[PDB]
Design a protein around this ligand. Structure first.
Ligand SMILES: *[C@@H]1O[C@H](CO)[C@@H](O)[C@H](O)[C@H]1NC(C)=O
Ligand SMILES: *[C@@H]1O[C@H](CO)[C@@H](O)[C@H](O)[C@H]1NC(C)=O
Ligand SMILES: *[C@@H]1O[C@H](CO)[C@@H](O)[C@H](O)[C@H]1NC(C)=O
Ligand SMILES: *[C@@H]1O[C@H](CO)[C@@H](O)[C@H](O)[C@H]1NC(C)=O
Ligand SMILES: *[C@@H]1O[C@H](CO)[C@@H](O)[C@H](O)[C@H]1NC(C)=O
Ligand SMILES: *[C@@H]1O[C@H](CO)[C@@H](O)[C@H](O)[C@H]1NC(C)=O
Ligand SMILES: *[C@@H]1O[C@H](CO)[C@@H](O)[C@H](O)[C@H]1NC(C)=O
Ligand SMILES: *[C@@H]1O[C@H](CO)[C@@H](O)[C@H](O)[C@H]1NC(C)=O
Lengths: 231, 231, 231, 231, 231, 231, 231, 231
């Protein structure tokens, strides 16, 4: 009796199953930025209140990439002299973390899926260049003495979904570099997070641990070019 | 006991039944463009990165038409000399595919419903003009030697929901030509898709197969005039 | 066993109960206009393609009013000479239908609730001025020989939520006249709808019967001043 | 049998549990303002129709603060001469109510949570300065003879999420003062609400009791700088 | 000797003769409004600080009409009920002054030239409707008992170059009624000016006598649609 | 004595000589459109009130071209089907008039100077295609039976300085075809002007003879992309 | 002979006499701000690079007032706490300099003409409040011990033509306080200028002496509401 | 007789002397860009049609600087990697030409005046780095083997009045580097100009010699931030 009716109740709930699953957001975040397209002018400007005069930093982010090219920028900090200060991006299947210069990069192979949220986070300290990438909370890659003894200066432009090219011409950003998908939980810290801290940054009810420099839901992140807040 | 309570549980879930059903999206697409009204200025501009110098193409699309007139444009590619290069549209009850010139068209009669999503897709190769229309994955119509030996040139304007008229006067598009409804999953390929490929393009978890020329969620599709992204 | 866990399943579904109920829309309409506030500049312009040279008309509408004043305009058609051609509005508790002139009005007392959708609809034919108001499908009021032998001319401005005052000064509309709430299913017909037609216009799956003059989801309705499309 | 199936039914409903919980709104409010970030230009201007020439007032509000600093403004009324006429704000953990002057403040310690809605409401009468703060319906703090014999004049600017600084320079608001979170049910009364009235203002189906001076869903509350209506 | 070189000096000054003559402005006026075209939406809004609750008024204007149709509006004040309260316009060759309603008007035949500045001033007192038109300082046409015992109420919209038709439709102003040319010295008084005052208003150094209700260079005149301030 | 001081008077007037000469305008025209650069999106839309359903037409224009390429468009009228209905342009040194189609055209060799105003007027009647080009009032080149028995239809877009390419893509107009310089006195007639009328149109005090279809200072000309009205 | 022709040469030059006189600018200034009207929202923001933490200051300005009311503001610097820090304004016929607060002010009677440029410069040093007003280079009125021992703090907003009221309400500036006319040569110094320097600031070729804090043609002055640069 | 009246004629012409002198433009240039202030965001973008893949180039510009700081940029071309490719700027009194990098530069001491137009042209060929600076047509300073064997690549942004800092942050350009004054005749050539050509570029009727890469009145120059075209 009850089982038979439960059959049709489940059949009905199937309609809302996918509708709720498609708009699900990771952690406890109630807002995210949507890049519906790889444009020549789509990006998001971040305006940290605290200066970026940082020697050690651990930048985490929740990403869901619809299409990943040879080079797709998640977030990137770049000054006038050197546009590749901090730059997390995605290759065809790997994740690349660039600190200091374009030549100093750390690559973690084949642990990013397209339509699934992943907590990509990258740590780096200037004492000996001990850089690491954690994906979904477990170590993905690590290297030492890369960009060692380097300090990212102030005045640089930090963006999400693009690299420093400027939009004083009505865009001008390289389309192939753009990011198309969803971003949330963008946090940057002034110190190397501990292992447990990195694990708990990408948990279930974890969208309330925000960095001091850039904090999701606190810092001025304004999208441009077509990106929008999908609350 | 449990059955009685299940009665009221189902009665309660009835309230969310329609609310979830009305905003349901086809395939796995999490975003779509809404044309709430037939205006003189409503359309959506598409900006393919790859040039449209194509001899064979298979253009798929998910459409839900609120009202269909004698001539309602779903998508249309048109150059300066000939505005009817590629044009998929809807008659009162039939679906029309135009390639090359307005005289060359293929008509499939009475398989489009108003308030229901349908995966209209049109294939065409210039070797002998073998054109086809598949609706919901099964062949709807086919013809041979139409617009044969024709090449759609570059520089043309591609739009969704309207035809090439231009909006340098504050609109100017013919209202009767406009489209009012919902569009999603707009993909254009550079080659004739195989039968299984066409079948799987309009499946359940099928909103991740995108064309190389125009790909939903990848290409710059910007609405104008009142059209908007209903995420 | 099953009953006990069903208790907590219902407790869980309670959280989504109200969230789905609050954004529920009447009929089968998937889109509506939200007037969040009574501003000096909030309204919605309607642009019928067919001229308003009508002798008989039946104008239906779905309304949910957050706050109703001495005079709150739902929709209003007004020419340059006479701004009170057609005007449906709400008094403190009654519904008023004005056709032809401000002196010719029909009042139906105390059948409008604030936070609940109601299908207010008004019919009028110029042969003898036989005007009627139906609320939720059942007759609310009726009168004869009011504005008889009158023809509403063309060129008039039709708005939803305000009356004809113009916004060439940055607003100027009377705040007290404004409408704050939700509107959907705005339809105007060129003929007096039959009783069954009026009953089925405000049904359950009834948001696909649209008028020839103004049709919800077909005609150009553009909000202004703060009103927005709440899909 | 039924129990086993109910196990996976609950497992499935878990996906929509959090999705519905994250966008839940308090009382019966169907609309709210979202401050996604602490910008230099984010706020919301309120335009009461009735003048603020009030001697006694009870200002209620529903707030959900993502991050609370040393000084975070929920709402603030300020004239040209004295910008601190009325100002409700949040310290690190306490709630502060300022009436008349910045020196006259009432502080209620440690009853505000970050990610949870709370019905903060403040009452004040000028007969003897008997001011009170109610949090979630129960008394949080109270004092007497503070700003006694004072009248808040007219012409002042009332904002939500910021204090009176002006935005004729492209912002200029102090970032640290800004509010980042969600606001709803902003009501201001011309008289001291009774205890039962304050209790029922922050109830379950209580988002229909609105003040005469400022009423949520009635008064012109236009956000600026990045604040949004999250319907 | 000197006489011979004077010929070349005059020939040189010839190049600046016309260039200075074309941009010459009448009276001592240093600024004027240019209506380059008869757009569908060209006009200028006037926002008098003092209310238009006037019984007797004198209104002057310096006009240079590039093209005059059957009906070309210089300025027009109109309320919601009656859009033809005050309206000065030009027929093919005559000047028409309308006060109260279209039925009662004053016409002065054939004293307006196209490319030449003319100082048109219409006066009217409600005691007996004694209305007069003065062109370039000399009386043109006078009538008595027209719109007698009439009072132009407040709230009406006053414009230059168009009638009261509203621009909430993206224009909508009748193209034919538009004004294309140059306007300056728009003044409206609360009392019928004396003959000597009328003569002095249209003098040489006379762009410093301005009306109390509307005063050129003091009142808020906002051009729209293509009209611009030609300083 | 007088001659000596006249020397310095002439020396002084030298400073204003060039300043007045550079901003000189031809005919009695007091306004003109300036195309400072050959932008990708610079043009001017023209919106004739009278439809372009014309069989015979004479079109004049005063032009001062800063730089003339292989193809520089002064004005161009083009429909959706055929964008080359009417098109007057400049080759490296010649003036080209196109009516009907690109195949049939009239060319007048080497009578256009760059920095000097020239009055180019092309006439054409459909009775036998008798087309003529008049430069500065004297006939330049005439031909017969070109585009004979052809009628330019309605709906076509008419622009100055560009072709019909549409700006819904944020521009897209071919840069090379653009016009950079100054334009004025754009007039189009519904009949072939007589020889004396053609001479008078390009006279000294001749900026008051305007066409019925398009008339300078009467028709609606909207510059776009960087073009502006240089009064 | 020469004298006779010189008569007509002078008659010719008469046409350009007034045209050049009306647009004349004082000093060697090549640009100025025009306030065509006393709008509700007309002003000009000034953004000094150097902070206003000044104890002694001299502030000059060239002013030409079309209409002067009971209180018309030339420039005004005001902080959040005290909006009347520095404020130079005009009464019906006198010039008023306000430093520190409203109570302490300096008044110079009847030396301002409406349509004539005047060089008003107010100096003030905090050692003993020795404040002075210089009009056209000759001292107008001086006082001692007014606002003595006072320091104007930083963060205050400095405007020309209005007070500190804010425009986040779409204006809100008091209309009466507005300034309508022309302004130029706005300079503010960090030290009390010497008498010879004061005289030289208002000379003939004197639009190249600019203050260190605010300098005309160097400091960032943005007109708003209708004000514009009349070059 | 004639001499006496000529005295007053000269006295009258004195009034227009300065008014014509202040708006005088050099060469035969009829248009120029005005930088009224040193805003945080004032500049002008230049969009050369021909790519900047140049080995030898000569770049001229007419400049009139109101205020010159330690570093004031006239024009600057900079790529992403190296923002200092080409950069002409002014020190306190000298003119500096930078090609390749900041380390290698050419300085010409003390030949720039503030309020006077000067024709600064820098030439450089990569064969041996033979760079030269010509001021007003006479060589100022030359050097050899500086940036030798260097090629300025494509994609770099070229601006007038600022460096390459990007305006995606709502400005961000360094205020000190900005340029405040007037610019015209901006030309860049693909080959080192000859000495006679250099002299002719800065002549009297010399505003018709324009470069192939960037040509004044041909290339797309868009002012931003407050800069405007002073025709
Ligand atoms: C992938 O991108 C890198 C730079 O990010 C590039 O060096 C490499 O060649 C690319 N792989 C290709 C093009 O196959
Ligand atoms: C339907 O549209 C076609 C063109 O798309 C037209 O030829 C045909 O006449 C229309 N049918 C009608 C008007 O009944
Ligand atoms: C209600 O409104 C009507 C006009 O719509 C007005 O005549 C009447 O006086 C109002 N009732 C009041 C003010 O009590
Ligand atoms: C908290 O803010 C108050 C003012 O609102 C301030 O006086 C106090 O010092 C702050 N507490 C700190 C800075 O620890
Ligand atoms: C001129 O205009 C008036 C109304 O302004 C109109 O009545 C009259 O017919 C017009 N004259 C014509 C059309 O010849
Ligand atoms: C000049 O332009 C025409 C088309 O307008 C073109 O056919 C011709 O080749 C051009 N001349 C050249 C490129 O030398
Ligand atoms: C002039 O203005 C002052 C304040 O600026 C005011 O106190 C005074 O009353 C005014 N004079 C009048 C209103 O006659
Ligand atoms: C002038 O500017 C240069 C850089 O352009 C700088 O190195 C130098 O120190 C400056 N001179 C000063 C600050 O006196």
């Amino acid at each position: 009796a009850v089982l038979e009716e439960l059959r049709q109740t489940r059949a009905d709930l199937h309609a809302v199953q996918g509708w709720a699953a498609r708009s699900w957001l990771p952690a406890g975040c109630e807002t995210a930025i949507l890049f519906p397209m790889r444009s020549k002018k789509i990006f998001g400007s971040v305006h940290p209140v605290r200066p970026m005069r940082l020697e050690s930093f651990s930048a985490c982010i929740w990403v869901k990439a619809t299409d990943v090219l040879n080079k797709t920028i998640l977030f990137s900090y770049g000054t006038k002299r050197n546009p590749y200060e901090i730059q997390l991006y995605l290759s065809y299947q790997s994740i690349v973390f660039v600190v200091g210069g374009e030549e100093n990069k750390l690559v973690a192979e084949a642990m990013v899926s397209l339509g699934r949220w992943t907590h990509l986070c990258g740590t780096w300290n200037s004492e000996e260049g001990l850089t690491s990438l954690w994906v979904n909370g477990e170590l993905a890659a690590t290297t030492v003495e890369m960009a060692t003894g380097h300090i990212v200066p102030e005045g640089g432009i930090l963006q999400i979904g693009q690299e420093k090219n400027g939009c004083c011409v009505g865009g001008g950003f390289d389309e192939t570099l753009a990011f198309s998908g969803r971003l949330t939980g963008f946090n940057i810290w002034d110190s190397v997070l501990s292992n447990e801290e990195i694990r708990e940054t990408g948990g279930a009810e974890s969208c309330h641990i925000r960095g001091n420099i850039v904090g999701w839901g606190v810092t001025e992140i304004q999208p441009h070019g077509g990106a929008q807040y999908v609350s």
